Structure formats: structure tokens, C-alpha cells
Design a protein around this nucleic acid. Structure first.
Lengths: 133, 60, 45, 178, 231
RNA sequence: AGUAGUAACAAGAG
RNA sequence: UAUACCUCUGCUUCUGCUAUU
RNA sequence: GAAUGCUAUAAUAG
């Protein structure tokens, strides 16, 4: 959807100094530590085998409730549902050569954003965070 | 390391490589390395780390 | 997620199934005739 | 050119180059001097203050948490019970099953430390016993002319090895080509 | 001693269940047996409440072939099994799971029960454990000086209330009889240091894994720690 | 034969 | 011995450690 | 005007 509802500017030829920085690869719905995320995932899919209730359960109470209602009607294997939620809760943060675009929704399109000797203007779709603005 | 070179001097770079690396490096030295590094660790942990080098020093 | 426990695998499996059955009975998922067999079979462990 | 001696554990021909005579040529030398290493380590420790203990701490705290299943992620490992390479996950299993026969249940506790305790303890066992499978013929009824069928069923048999034979296997390294 | 005491009084079922519960927290049953007794009593007191308590198909309590009790024992069962049971019940009936692990659960009342054995006063110890819970579990505290302090809604029958007080001051007398009551009076506290001792074989291997000019490993250890090899 | 190259395959097994 | 002009097999004829994660 | 640090079956590197 972000690619589809996008707008491409102009390509420009000229030197680009790329800097290698640790950036987020994929936009998350809500960012948590692995452990916090894991427990939130447990509450959604496997309530009985959750273990000790952590305070984290209460913090993401609406997320769990929301997700559990959305994934309620399904016949897909729970292990697949687990890793899908993990994909959009656990952060994939890795080193990449960037040049004036750190936002995940930009990073995901990093291959089309620039090279060493050229730069392409690209506007993602949907929404953009006010903090990132 | 480039910029911190003395002015009016020469900075040189030895593109290096160590031959017979695994063949020469001795376990008994690696045992010493653990003993030195685990100086202020409890006695059990000093002994724990010491095993792996010891096993390699008697390897078949 | 990796299950944790130094106890027996059978022990774990027994209790969970015992619970599941008890709740399945009282809830009304499981029948009396089935619950008879449930506790009987679990008794053999 | 180092100290050659016979191991009173395995009976093997051990050679020790360390603290040996310094080389007279540019041919590869293993004759590293302990003092020179320790000095180099000291210099490192000076210029990186309190890193050794900092690392030793974290490493030690890591060990405590580390489970045994950590060993079930390393390609083909040498299995001493069958004297051939096996998958890491099976190599561990075979060792755990064999350890139980010699009254070594450290693996059951879950952590790596008590399992490791069992490994160095297993060297003190006078004889080490382990399962090794043998096949057995058995008549089984069938819609056959003669009315039966022979099938080979495997059964675990307890094999023993001596204190030394086990040690050597523990210290053994399987070789291949890259 | 305490070691041989527990063999006479308690059954081997109660012994091993407590030892496992105590082992989970990584504390030696033999080196700290005062703490073992606490859990043993905690377990035996709990098991007496759910010994003969049953439920019929209509849904009423009675005293006992047949298999469906009125109570559900949680203390004694390994952590993950105990928690599974606690979560399973809460979800089915439709109530919030307590943050701390419960001891018992009544199928008729449909509420969690917290048990606590105390040395001194029973009534004061009720208010100590009212801070954490509040209104999560229906507390049921007991002490050794023949004193009871239950919640307002007490399901425990007067006949069953006696059996607790019997064993409370049956074994208490047995502790004083053999002069072993004074063992639990003292403050037992010691940290369980993770020791890793080397055997005979591996030690010998380490002694022969030494650089030249060293008798044994002890020599190498001290040399590295002590002497300064500058220059 | 050939592939190939410090040692193999050019079928192996019941 | 024989079944066998049959049947089974095609990384298992020893494939390590570590980093990019 | 910063972060959030981890763990694959490929490939490359040592």
C-alpha cells in the first residue's frame, strides 16, 4: 500500500556521501523489547501457556484485545500467526548505508532512494509520524 | 589513524597476513590468557575457563 | 517459545489434559460418558 | 625444538614449544614466551582499564543462564558413542542418554554448568557404558503362504569402554578436507 | 536432626514434592532443611483441605471409584504446571488471574484461596499478606498456637477446621519430644554459591598442560597472578 | 578411455 | 548355492568454528 | 534532538 499510494520525484546525478548507520528495516505497529513482545504474542494466541502475568500485559491491553478480535476468524496455523505478529512488534534494526532518510518507510525502499552517484525523490503512502517530521 | 600522523612524516600501511596461524598458536598460551583475564573472578570460574584450553593441549 | 521445566514430559502432559477435561466437562464441551473415559484413561498414568 | 614428553594420562607423545628456544630463522615458530604474552596482556589491560573483569563478569553471568540446548546448534559434531560425526542435536542426546547409564543426571537440571560438571566428572569413571543398537529377527503373523513374516527389530545393548579409551574419545578430533 | 525427622512424620509423596519445589528456587534440601519443613507443612496443611472434598453431578459438596474434587491443589506442582492450572481456571470461569501464585482454588465458591503458616500471631499475619493481594484471593491463615484467621466467606467446615489444629499441635509436640523444635527457632540464612569442583582425571590433564618451567598448574596460576613481567 | 589433478569417479548394495 | 533379465539407492563415501544475524 | 543490539538452511569472509 505504501508503494502503491506513493509519488516519485526526479532522479538526480551527482555525488552522494552515504553514511553507514544502524536503522529500522520495517515499520512496527508498536515497538517493544523481544521479551515484552513475546509475552504480548503469548496473550493473543496461547493464553493458557502464558506464565507469570507481567505489568507489560496491562500496558498493551488494547493491542492484545484488538489483535485477538482481528485474528479470531482464521484457519491459518498459529505458528505462522505468531511470527507475523513478531514481525510487526519485534524491531529489525540493522546497519545500512543511508543518506538523508532514516525513517523505516523510507529504509524499506532504500535501494530505489539513492546510490553513490545518484539520488531519487520518493514519497511513501498512508501516514507519517509527527516526531519524525 | 590517518590524520593523527606526524606532519612532515610518512604513514605506511602493511597489508598483512599470518601464515601457519592455527599450526603455531599453542593451547598452553591460551590457558595463560584465560588465567590473566579471569584475575578478579571467583575460583570456580577461573577453573571453568581453564578446561577448554587444557582439553586442546591434550587433544588427539 | 521454548517450554521450561525440569520435571517429566509425561507429568506435564497429564496435568494439562486432566485440567482441559475437567473444564471441558463443567463448561459443557465434554459429556459424562466421555468424562468417565477421560479420568479413567488418565488414571492409568 | 621444544620439550617432548610422554603423557601419563593417555600415553601419548606430547610436545610443548612454549617458553622454548627463540628461533634462528624466519621459518614458522610456535616458541612463544609466556612473559612476553603476559606483558602484552598487561599493556592491553592498562590501556583498556577494567575490561578483563568487566568481560569476565558478563561471561560468567551469561554461563549461569545458559541452558544445555545451546549445544544443539553447531552442524556436525563428533559422537564418541558411535565414533563418527552426527548432527549436533543428536550428538548431545547420545551423550546425555549415555551419561544417565553412568549415574550422571546433571543435564536434567537444565543449566549448562551442571552438565559441564558431569563432562569433567565422566573422565573419573573407571568404565563408561553407552547404548549401541543391534538388530533381532522376529516372526510376525501375516497373510502369507506360510502365514508369517520375519522382520528385523533394533534393540539397545549396553557397551562398555575403559577409563583411557573414553578420555581419548573425549579428546578426539574428527578430520575432513575443506 | 531435621534430616531423619521428616522421614517419620511426613510421607515420601510430601517429601519429594517439597524437595522439587525447593530445588526450583535452587536451594539445597539438606543444607537448609528448616525451609523444607515450612514447605512440607504448607503442602500437608493444603492436602488435608482437599483430601475427602468431592462434588456430585448436581453440583454440591460431600465427603467420600469417583473422581472430581471440590478443591484444586496448586502448591507442590512445578511452576509451569502450577501456573497453567491457575490461568486455565481463571479464563474458563471468567476472572482475572492473580499476579502471585495461589495455593488452592474452590470449584463451588469459584475464587482463589491463599494459605500461610506463621510462627507467631495468626491475625497479624493476615494483615501482612493483605498488602499484596487486597481482594485477589480469599486468605486462610493459620498458626501453631491454636489460632485461626479466615476470610469472612469461610468455606472451611468446623469438622475440617479441627483436623488442621490436630496436625498443627501433633507434630509440634513431636518436635519438642525429640528436642528438635529448637532447630526451627534459630535464624537460618546462607547463600548458595555455585561451586564447580574438578575431579582427579581432569586435574592431572591440567597439570600436564603447563608451559616449560612449571611443576603443576598451581605454579602457573600463582606466577600469572603475582609476578610482573615488564620489559 | 576420459574426466580430472596430490585422489578420486568411470555405479553401489541385497 | 539359489531366487536375480529380480529388488533397493543417487549429498549420508566422516563437510568444522566464527562474523555479516 | 540521541538512542533501543541481536541471532537462520543460502552466499561471502577469516
Amino acid at each position: 500500500m505504501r508503494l502503491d499510494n506513493a509519488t516519485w520525484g526526479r532522479i538526480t546525478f551527482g555525488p552522494v556521501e552515504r553514511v553507514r548507520k544502524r536503522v529500522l528495516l520495517n515499520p512496527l505497529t508498536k515497538e517493544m523489547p523481544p521479551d515484552e513482545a513475546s509475552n504480548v504474542i503469548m496473550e493473543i494466541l496461547f493464553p493458557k501457556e502464558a506464565g507469570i502475568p507481567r505489568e507489560s500485559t496491562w500496558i498493551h491491553r488494547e493491542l492484545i484485545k484488538e489483535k485477538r478480535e482481528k485474528l479470531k476468524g482464521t484457519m491459518i496455523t498459529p505458528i505462522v500467526l505468531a511470527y507475523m505478529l513478531e514481525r510487526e512488534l519485534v524491531a529489525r534494526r540493522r546497519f545500512l548505508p543511508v543518506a538523508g532518510a532514516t525513517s523505516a518507510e523510507f529504509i524499506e525502499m532504500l535501494h530505489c532512494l539513492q546510490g553513490e552517484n545518484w539520488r531519487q525523490i520518493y514519497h511513501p503512502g498512508g501516514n507519517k509520524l509527527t516526531e519524525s517530521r | 589513524m590517518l590524520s593523527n600522523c606526524p606532519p612532515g612524516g610518512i604513514s605506511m600501511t602493511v597489508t598483512g597476513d599470518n601464515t601457519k596461524w592455527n599450526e603455531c598458536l599453542n593451547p598452553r598460551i591460551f590457558l595463560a590468557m584465560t588465567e590473566r583475564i579471569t584475575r578478579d573472578s571467583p575460583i570456580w570460574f577461573r577453573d571453568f575457563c581453564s578446561i577448554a584450553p587444557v582439553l586442546f593441549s591434550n587433544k588427539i | 517459545r521454548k517450554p521450561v521445566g525440569q520435571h517429566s514430559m509425561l507429568e506435564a502432559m497429564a496435568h494439562r489434559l486432566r485440567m482441559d477435561a475437567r473444564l471441558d466437562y463443567e463448561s459443557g464441551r465434554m459429556s459424562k460418558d466421555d468424562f468417565e473415559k477421560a479420568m479413567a484413561h488418565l488414571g492409568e498414568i | 625444538k621444544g620439550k617432548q614428553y610422554i603423557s601419563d594420562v593417555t600415553g601419548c607423545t606430547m610436545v610443548d614449544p612454549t617458553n622454548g628456544p627463540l628461533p634462528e630463522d624466519n621459518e614458522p615458530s610456535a616458541y612463544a614466551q609466556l612473559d612476553c604474552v603476559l606483558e602484552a596482556l598487561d599493556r592491553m589491560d592498562e590501556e583498556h582499564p577494567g575490561l578483563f573483569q568487566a568481560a569476565s563478569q558478563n561471561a560468567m553471568e551469561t554461563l549461569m543462564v545458559t541452558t544445555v540446548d545451546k549445544l544443539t546448534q553447531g552442524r556436525q559434531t563428533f559422537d564418541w558413542t558411535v565414533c563418527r560425526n552426527q548432527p549436533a542435536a543428536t550428538a548431545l542426546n547420545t551423550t546425555i542418554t549415555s551419561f544417565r547409564l553412568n549415574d550422571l543426571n546433571g543435564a536434567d537440571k537444565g543449566g549448562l554448568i551442571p552438565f559441564c560438571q558431569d563432562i569433567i566428572d565422566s573422565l573419573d569413571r573407571p568404565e563408561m557404558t553407552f547404548f549401541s543398537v543391534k538388530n533381532i529377527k522376529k516372526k510376525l503373523p501375516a497373510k502369507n503362504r506360510k502365514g508369517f513374516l520375519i522382520k528385523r527389530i533394533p534393540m539397545k545393548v549396553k557397551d562398555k569402554i575403559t577409563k583411557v579409551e573414553y578420555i581419548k574419545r573425549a579428546l578426539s578430533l574428527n578430520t575432513m578436507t575443506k | 536432626s531435621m534430616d531423619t525427622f521428616i522421614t517419620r512424620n511426613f510421607q515420601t509423596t510430601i517429601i519429594q514434592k517439597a524437595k522439587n519445589t525447593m530445588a526450583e528456587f535452587s536451594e539445597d534440601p539438606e543444607l537448609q532443611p528448616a525451609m523444607l519443613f515450612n514447605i512440607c507443612v504448607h503442602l500437608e496443611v493444603c492436602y488435608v483441605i482437599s483430601d475427602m472434598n468431592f462434588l456430585d453431578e448436581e453440583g454440591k459438596a460431600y465427603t467420600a471409584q469417583n473422581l472430581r474434587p471440590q478443591y484444586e491443589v496448586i502448591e507442590g506442582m512445578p511452576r509451569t504446571i502450577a501456573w497453567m492450572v491457575q490461568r486455565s481456571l481463571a479464563q474458563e470461569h471468567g476472572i482475572e488471574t492473580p499476579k502471585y501464585l495461589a495455593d488452592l482454588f474452590d470449584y463451588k465458591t469459584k475464587r482463589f484461596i491463599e494459605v500461610g503458616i506463621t510462627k507467631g500471631l495468626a491475625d497479624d499475619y493476615f494483615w501482612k499478606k493483605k498488602e499484596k493481594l487486597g481482594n485477589s484471593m480469599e486468605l486462610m491463615i493459620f498458626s501453631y498456637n491454636q489460632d485461626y484467621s479466615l476470610s469472612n466467606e469461610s468455606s472451611l467446615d468446623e469438622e475440617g477446621k479441627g483436623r488442621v489444629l490436630s496436625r498443627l499441635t501433633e507434630l509440634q509436640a513431636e518436635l519438642s519430644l525429640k528436642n528438635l523444635w529448637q532447630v526451627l527457632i534459630g535464624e537460618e540464612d546462607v547463600e548458595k554459591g555455585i561451586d564447580f569442583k574438578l575431579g582427579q582425571t581432569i586435574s592431572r590433564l591440567r597439570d600436564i598442560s603447563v608451559p616449560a618451567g612449571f611443576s603443576n598448574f598451581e605454579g602457573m596460576r600463582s606466577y600469572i597472578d603475582n609476578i610482573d613481567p615488564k620489559g
